[PDB]
Swiss-Prot record, chain A:
Pfam families: Ribosomal_S2 (PF00318). It comes from the Bacteria. The gene is rpsB. Transmembrane segments: none annotated. This is Small ribosomal subunit protein uS2. It comes from Escherichia coli (strain K12). Part of the 30S ribosomal subunit, contacts bS1. Some nascent polypeptide chains are able to cross-link to this protein in situ. In collided ribosomes contacts ribosome rescue factor SmrB.
Curated annotation (Swiss-Prot), chain B:
HAMAP family: Ribosomal_uS8_B (MF_01302_B). One of its GO terms (cellular component) is cytosol. One of its GO terms (molecular function) is rRNA binding. This is Small ribosomal subunit protein uS8. GO terms for biological process: cytoplasmic translation; regulation of mRNA stability; regulation of translation; ribosomal small subunit assembly. The gene is rpsH. It comes from Escherichia coli (strain K12). Part of the 30S ribosomal subunit. Contacts proteins S5 and S12. Transmembrane segments: none annotated. PROSITE patterns: RIBOSOMAL_S8 (PS00053).
Swiss-Prot record, chain C:
Induction: Part of the metY operon that extends to pnp, also has its own promoter. NCBIfam families: S15_bact. The lineage of its organism: Bacteria, Pseudomonadati, Pseudomonadota, Gammaproteobacteria, Enterobacterales. The keyword Nucleus does not apply. It comes from Escherichia coli (strain K12). This is Small ribosomal subunit protein uS15.
RNA sequence: GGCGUAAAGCGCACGCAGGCGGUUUGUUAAGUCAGAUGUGAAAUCCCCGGGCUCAACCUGGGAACUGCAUCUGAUACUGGCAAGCUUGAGUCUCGUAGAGGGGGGUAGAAUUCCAGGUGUAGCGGUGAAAUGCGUAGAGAUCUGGAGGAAUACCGGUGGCGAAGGCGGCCCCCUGGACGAAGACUGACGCUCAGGUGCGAAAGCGUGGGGAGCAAACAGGAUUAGAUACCCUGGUAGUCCACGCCGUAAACGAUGUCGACUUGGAGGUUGUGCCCUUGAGGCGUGGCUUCCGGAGCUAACGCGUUAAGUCGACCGCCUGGGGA
């Protein structure tokens, strides 16, 4: 949140001037070497407001859903969402995880049944061909739905990295009225998000800074 | 060529409102300033200022409520190709009274309800809803 | 078109100053000079329609300037049309 | 209510009548507005009652008759008049790019033809053939000459032009566009029925010219037939001068003029700034190609060069045939 730590983390950096979105004009400070520079004076108050609303949602019995699938922010999202008893989607977002929850609930049930019969059940009726088949199905289903297995229903807030990369999740949350907290870069569309946090979403240290701040605020919210 | 500057002012307001512009600028005129006064006193624009002496430039500060346009519709009624004059008993009411109709009566430019209370008719400049 | 010296001469004899190059009299005189000069070119090049379009542009511009001058001040209009030899 | 594709933008432009017209002051009170007066026949329409036992019907009173004229005022807007102003529109200075137009000259490559040398049996053409040319020496090759037409490479969703269109090089005459900084005139403007002008190709008239190509035409093929596609020739024509014709899927199937509305990548042509580092970067105009946002659209798609939001004027459409 500290603008010095932000500027040292690489938050102010943006994409090239070609790929920019004109809707991101209020949050752009300028350009250097044909890449956009995000205005941190605009970034820190919006990030603080987003953190305040996230803390409210956490303290009011809420479920946060951390969404980010880029190879830069996958493991970071996993660590952040596990560090606060939350849920994450760090791999491919299945089209309809939220709007078609009544159908992916069955896949969650299947994943849970498979992992219980593998670990606690320990069928041992292997056949050495259906066993490896079931383990591969379990690993696919876990890489797809491993973060939201203990969610139960739809979350109350989405924290998205690279709002352009995750337009499907944002559109689903907007269809369901769930507030969206997205790290919107200079090339992304800030229309479908509620709490736009204009900052770099490609550098790894920037997303670790964002996720650490969000994890801290949601933990302090959990602990009231 | 420029044959209707009042319709041009209305079009500038409409296009600046649709583009979420903060303020719109245009060459000034007495009738433009009167219509801008009528719009400001009715609450459709925030403020207006006239800058310059030999070439006055009128600048209207557009108004938004919920990130939405305050001026939903603005149309030119009386135009150079067809002039529209109305008597006081047939003055139009826009949006069943929720909108205003800028009327140019012999006592200056005013709204349709002000011209009705004053017992006057005249040229229907525009409809603002 | 007209040379610089001929244009300067016309501006001087038809203008209220050596810099009054925009007066209606100066414009009409310059257009008349260009038309009279082009007359000889088109006597020899009767199939030059592309240049005759610019000639007719000059003619119509001079006509509109003369109409404006006659509507503005008829005395200067008469002085101009007698000094230039117009009125068909 | 419409005109990109469903019917509908004149092929393009100039322009008279007409329509509309930047901005300020004064004046008038023509349009406009307000009030009053006169009139707007009665019946009818409508409202409240009355009489027919009810109704139809009859009838009292009122409202209405949205109109016209006159008189008295108002002056915001439109109009008239007078004086202004510079931002629209033009003039001048200096340059820039361009297949813009008209006239004359010239250059090289190639096709064809004529004459000659070498040389010998084929050449040409096709899916295959044949018609055709060739022992009278073809085709091939070499040399010289004649004539006409068009300008390889450059060459490019490049440039110029109102449109149609414009392509070697040189000279002569000539139109438009754009840019820099100023000076000047001061609404002189936009559109335009009728009118006039330009208007691909084909076609027509007169006089030339005629290499190549090629309607018609002839022959050889193919075919059931083949008045065609294919082949061998070939006249008009294509070319030039001067007239006529006035039509095209004359297309962006998108009239002209002006204002406003997020962006990206290019092309072309000026101009300004900076140790010019560089064939550099950053601005600022003109024209132009592709994609795409809001918006619009029946959709396709258009999208700052709008088919978005508006204003002025014009042309056009009203089911398919007949036509």
């Amino acid at each position: 949140v500290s603008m010095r730590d932000m500027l040292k983390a690489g938050v102010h950096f943006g994409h090239q001037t070609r790929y920019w979105n004109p809707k991101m004009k209020p949050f752009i400070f300028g350009a250097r070497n044909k890449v956009h520079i995000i205005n941190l004076e605009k970034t820190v108050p919006m990030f603080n407001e987003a953190l305040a609303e996230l803390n409210k949602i956490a303290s009011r019995k809420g479920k946060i859903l951390f969404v980010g699938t880029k190879r830069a922010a996958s493991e970071a999202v996993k660590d952040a969402a596990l560090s606060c008893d939350q849920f994450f989607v760090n791999h491919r977002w299945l089209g309809g995880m939220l709007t078609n929850w009544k159908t992916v609930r069955q896949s969650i049930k299947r994943l849970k049944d498979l992992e219980t019969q593998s670990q606690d059940g320990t069928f041992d009726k292997l056949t050495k061909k259906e066993a490896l088949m079931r383990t591969r199905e379990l690993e696919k289903l876990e890489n797809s739905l491993g973060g939201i297995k203990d969610m139960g229903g739809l979350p109350d807030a989405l924290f998205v990295i690279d709002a352009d990369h995750e337009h499907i999740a944002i559109k689903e949350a907007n269809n369901l009225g769930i507030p969206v907290f997205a790290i919107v870069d200079t090339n992304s569309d800030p229309d479908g998000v509620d709490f736009v946090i204009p900052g770099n979403d490609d550098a790894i240290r920037a997303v670790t800074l964002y996720l650490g701040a969000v994890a801290a605020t949601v933990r302090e919210g959990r602990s009231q | 060529s420029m044959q209707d500057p009042i319709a041009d002012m209305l079009t500038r307001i409409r296009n600046g409102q649709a583009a979420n512009k903060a303020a719109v600028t245009m060459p000034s005129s007495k009738l433009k300033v009167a219509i801008a006064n009528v719009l400001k006193e009715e609450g459709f624009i925030e403020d207006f200022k006239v800058e310059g002496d030999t070439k006055p430039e009128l600048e209207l500060t557009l108004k938004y409520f919920q990130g939405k346009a305050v001026v939903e519709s603005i149309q030119r009624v009386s135009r150079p190709g067809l002039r529209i004059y109305k008597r006081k008993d047939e003055l139009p009411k826009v949006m069943a009274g929720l909108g205003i109709a800028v009327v140019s009566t012999s006592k200056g430019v005013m709204t349709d309800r002000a011209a009705r209370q004053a017992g006057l008719g005249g040229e229907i400049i525009c409809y603002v809803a | 078109s007209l040379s610089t010296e001929a244009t300067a001469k016309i501006v001087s004899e038809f203008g209220r100053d050596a810099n009054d190059t925009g007066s209606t009299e100066v414009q009409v005189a310059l257009l008349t000079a260009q038309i009279n000069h082009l007359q000889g070119h088109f006597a020899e090049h009767k199939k030059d329609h592309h240049s005759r379009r610019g000639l007719l542009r000059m003619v119509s511009q001079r006509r509109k300037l003369l109409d404006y001058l006659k509507r503005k001040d008829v005395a200067r209009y008469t002085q101009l049309i007698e000094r230039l030899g117009l009125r068909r």
